[PDB]
């Protein structure tokens, strides 16, 4: 229903923003882009719990103890101990977000002027990278192609 | 939903601000820029809870004791040891805010004059960074460009 | 919502104070400043409970004691003892506030009148830094740069 | 909200008693000051609560006492001993105040008349450090540069 | 809110009886005095309990005692030793005053007539000093200077 509607809006915001920014270099509109937004609507929850380790005796906890040593000569021995530690934690309850953008994709067109160079596409498929929001962490993919227009 | 709005009103702050900040050296509009700002709405609790070591017996907290130690003499020998002891604690309960910004993308270009020099752009590039808000902490990202305008 | 006009608020008394105090140096309008503070928003408590430590016997705190000493003679010998102590104690509840500065960042240019020298853009430099309320605990960024004016 | 308004106000005393008292030396109006007030808000309660030691036989607080010794002659011996003490006690309820003065930080700028000697600008310096409230408890910053006027 | 009030009225008392007592020695309005009071608004409570030490046998305050002794002749002995003290005591219960003047500082000019000598001087501070109210306990700083006026 809505989703669809509020997807359009997103692409609608990333393709304005990077015509904006690419339109003074190459000109009024001798370029363009479409961009496609993997959104999730997906409803998640979470709840960690973290301890840290206590180990170590360098830097162990004791809320009590015992430690009781026999000792004859045949030389018979006995060690025992009973401990009781404290232990740290971390508790967090983190409810996402419904309506992030999980994966991006854009195709970009560019005029000709005919050929333009390796240098200037370069720095045009950099800026648009950074204006995208760029992230290969979400699997974002970028490709811009260079063709005379008709 | 309105997250959007939000989302547009933070980056043209930001957007603003480095324009009016780079217009003065290079000219009245010799300079374009558009942000990017990865936000988040993920509402999210906390609560730690730490212990300071008390393992070393330097500083440790006795509330109680108790040390038997026996010796006959075939140098038998006893050792008993009771401890109670009393520990440190702090406990945070930290609600974060929804709406922070977690990360930025910037793409600013600047006129020619024609190249401008070397120093000259990257004194302007550290000014966009020092008026962003820059920080390697949340993996910003900023890249200036030099082409002619049309 | 509100926190941006806060935010802004922040920021316009940080940049009239930096303007006011630099422009009897180096004139009526020749100076200008864009600051951008990251505030912090979220809900903080803490409990700490601090303990003076009574292991060392030259200033424990007794509220009991029982000493037993036997001793025969082949030198067989016991010792029991049973403490109860008595131990300090700290306890602050710090509810933290929600608006705090966590950190800055100021970039300011400079007109020519024709290059300034290196001491008086030192001393500028140390003007703002101390008009900023500069501390290197918050991880705070400054960068004053001159260049001619347009 | 008004916390801002309540730190302009205690600026602007400070601002004013420095300017009032440093005028009379250099002039009517060839100095200005512009102070940076890093206030606390956080709500912050309190509970000490000390004891002295008597460990020591010197004055130790006998409640009660029981000193059993036995001896036999083959020197076998005993010596059994339960005290019962009494101890000092102070309790603090320190409930701190909000709106305290963490920090501050002070620039001032004096006029030519052309340069002013070092030890006016000493004497000058020392005045503005005792009218500001210094403590290099707090931490404050103090930096007084001279410059002429335009 | 009221605090600055508070405080401007102490410092304004403070001030006109420093001139006031200054004044008919070097001249009807040739000096002039700023101080910054420090004062302090947290409520605070206390509670001692003190108690008188009893170990020394020439001052005990025995209620009960039972003192057994047993000797045979092989010289075997014994010597049990029961008893029952009473102690002094002492408690306050202290409730701090909110409004007290925690730190004080005060700077001073006096006018030429051209120097005036360093007797002259010492005995200005001096009067200064004693109408403070100056106190070396609450780290209280003065600083008297001669220079021209204009």
Do not use: C, W
């Not at 960690?48 to 004859?72: F, M, V, W």
């Not at 005919?114 to 974002?140: H, N, V």
């Amino acid at each position: 229903d809505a989703q669809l509607k509020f997807a359009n809006d997103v692409e609608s915001r990333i393709q304005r923003r990077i015509e904006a920014i690419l339109s003074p270099i190459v000109g009024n509109g001798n370029v363009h882009a479409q961009v496609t937004a993997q959104l999730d609507f997906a409803n998640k929850e979470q709840t960690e719990e973290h301890y840290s380790p206590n180990g170590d005796a360098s830097k162990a906890t004791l809320r009590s103890r015992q430690l009781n040593i026999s000792e004859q000569v045949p030389r018979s021995t006995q060690r025992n101990e009973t401990s009781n530690y404290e232990v740290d934690r971390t508790i967090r309850h983190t409810k996402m977000n419904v309506g992030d953008i999980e994966r991006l994709s854009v195709a970009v067109v560019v005029n000709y002027k005919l050929p333009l160079t390796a240098d200037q596409m370069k720095q045009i498929e950099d800026l648009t990278r950074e204006a995208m929001g760029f992230s290969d962490k979400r699997g974002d993919t970028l490709n811009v192609v260079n063709s005379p227009f008709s």
